Design a protein around this ligand. Structure first.
Ligand code: DV2
Lengths: 86, 141, 103
């Protein structure tokens, strides 16, 4: 089961349903497609990577690597995080 | 309230830094004050002498971000069995995307300049509210 | 040994996972479920290099330490336009703005 997350510039990111429910704001918008008018693809692709990262490493006994963020996307990514509550 | 018990019963421990951060070990003394100890570079480990019922916790030495030890916040040395040290496996937690973004913004922008960033006042306050050992201790109460 | 991928065609990006011992044909079956095109009308790539159906993902350089959750590796995807295969086209993401003076 998958869901389509759509950036402001038209990119269609397809991710698993359970991974997208990490964000409570997305949980609200669904409960198959969602459109983000304010989040461009270079920001939204990173959000999708964070979901994958959280689902793998949450309650994990292994070593956990850093989630990297390039300086050029930090301000925009922060604002997406605050909106999405993840 | 949160403090080490003065047991005087020895306990050998391995502080194993399995994180990318330089780690600051912090011992909570007999009055509950945090005493800082020598740092550990990423990927390194040390064998150290502590005592049963002593409270320890672990932070990033530069920024003071919180780290886990055996999946939790607090670590308490216990009874050694068969000449075998207790492992204190220090790791990163799964930070929220928001908190992780805040860390990255703090590392690039000086506290003087936070007000010059083009963001809502909610985020100014979030940036200013630095990680702090004293704050974390009052929560546990 | 899990690996984490971005399968990409035009302005579509599929986030999925597999093992190092998975075959390329199993990646096409995942694409079939989502985008509704059979394996023989798909063509998967690592950059310019075409990936044959019998090849495992480990052989083709997708490893658990390179293809990570937080930094997934890209697999290119091209469909057959009834008769013949289109050229591989993957639209770039948007560009971040210039860093301010304070960064
Ligand atoms: C009577 C008593 O319990 N006194 C306390 C002050 C004591 O001896 N402590 C408190 C903690 O349980 C540890 C122990 C000490 S001060 N052990 C010596 C020690 C010195 C350096 C380290 C560290 S921490 C990171 N690197 C090193 C070398 C660890 C332990």
């Amino acid at each position: 089961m998958y869901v389509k997350l759509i950036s402001s510039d038209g990119h269609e990111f397809i991710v698993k349903r359970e991974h997208a429910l990490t964000s409570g704001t997305i949980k609200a918008m669904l409960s198959n497609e969602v459109n983000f008018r304010e989040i461009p693809s270079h920001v939204l692709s990173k959000v999708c990577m964070y979901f994958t990262y959280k689902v793998r490493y949450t309650n994990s006994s292994t070593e956990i690597p850093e989630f990297p963020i390039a300086p050029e996307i930090a301000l925009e990514l922060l604002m997406a995080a605050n909106f999405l509550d993840c | 309230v949160l403090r080490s018990v003065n047991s005087r019963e020895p306990s050998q421990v391995i502080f194993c830094n399995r994180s990318p951060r330089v780690v600051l070990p912090v011992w909570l003394n007999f009055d509950g004050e945090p005493q800082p100890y020598p740092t550990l570079p990423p990927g390194t480990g040390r064998r150290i002498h502590s005592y049963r019922g002593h409270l320890w916790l672990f932070r990033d030495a530069g920024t003071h971000d919180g780290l886990l030890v055996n999946q939790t916040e607090l670590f308490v040395p216990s009874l050694n069995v068969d000449g075998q040290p207790i492992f204190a496996n220090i790791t990163l937690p799964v930070y929220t995307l928001k908190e992780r973004c805040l860390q990255v913004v703090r590392s690039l922008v000086k506290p003087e300049n936070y007000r010059r960033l083009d963001i809502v006042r909610s985020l100014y306050e979030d940036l200013e509210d630095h990680p702090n050992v004293q704050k974390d201790l009052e929560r546990l109460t | 040994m899990d690996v984490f991928l971005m399968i990409r065609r035009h302005k579509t990006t599929i986030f999925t996972d597999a093992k190092e011992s998975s075959t390329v044909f199993e990646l096409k079956r995942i694409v079939e479920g989502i985008l509704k095109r059979p394996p023989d009308e798909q063509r998967l790539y690592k950059d310019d290099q075409l990936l044959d159906d019998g090849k495992t993902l480990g052989e083709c350089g997708f490893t658990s330490q390179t293809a990570r959750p937080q930094a997934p590796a890209t697999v290119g995807l091209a469909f057959r336009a009834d008769d013949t295969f289109e050229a591989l086209c993957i639209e770039p993401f948007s560009s971040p703005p210039e860093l301010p003076d304070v960064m």
